[PDB]
Design a protein around this ligand. Structure first.
Ligand SMILES: Cc1cnc(Nc2ccc(C(=O)NC3CCN(C)CC3)c(F)c2)nc1Nc1ccc(Cl)c(NS(=O)(=O)C(C)(C)C)c1
Length: 121
């Protein structure tokens, strides 16, 4: 896929921090009532966003993040944080500050930031 969820040349593993990213960070956000627009890649056709992929060059979604964790794709929890930040930043870049999707992203980001601040090690 694009972005990729597997790469045979890239070292990957599951540390305590990556276990925390999966079992605490991703799983908590997945249960949130505002998380569903982020489970899958943005569908620019269904949503009538013809310029979406002209503006957003590094797409990211929580389904991709979940698969990366399931595949031991990451070496560092910092990479998982990067993916979340790409997802949030993409939302803030593309959309108007008043769009409901932006408020939904802000709610998830606050939980992401709180859980990351409490990550051990
Ligand atoms: C990840 C993501 C990033 N960006 C955007 N951008 C966007 C996507 C959709 C409109 C939209 O439909 N706005 C309507 C247009 C007509 N008006 C009358 C009312 C507002 C818009 F404004 C922005 N979406 C994303 N995912 C997403 C996935 C599923 C759905 Cl159903 C939606 N639709 S949504 O945003 O409207 C809702 C979640 C609040 C129902 C969005």
């Amino acid at each position: 896929s694009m972005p990729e969820v597997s790469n045979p040349s890239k070292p990957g593993r599951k540390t305590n921090q990556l276990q925390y990213m999966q079992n605490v960070v991703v799983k908590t956000l997945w249960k949130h009532q505002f998380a569903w627009p982020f489970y899958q890649p943005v569908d620019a056709i269904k949503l009538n966003l013809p310029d979406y992929h002209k503006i957003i060059k590094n797409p990211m979604d929580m389904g991709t993040i979940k698969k990366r964790l399931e595949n031991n794709y990451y070496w560092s929890a910092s990479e998982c944080m990067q993916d979340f930040n790409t997802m949030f930043t993409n939302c803030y870049i593309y959309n108007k500050p008043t769009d409901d999707i932006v408020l939904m992203a802000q709610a998830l980001e606050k939980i992401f930031l709180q859980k990351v601040a409490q990550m051990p090690q």
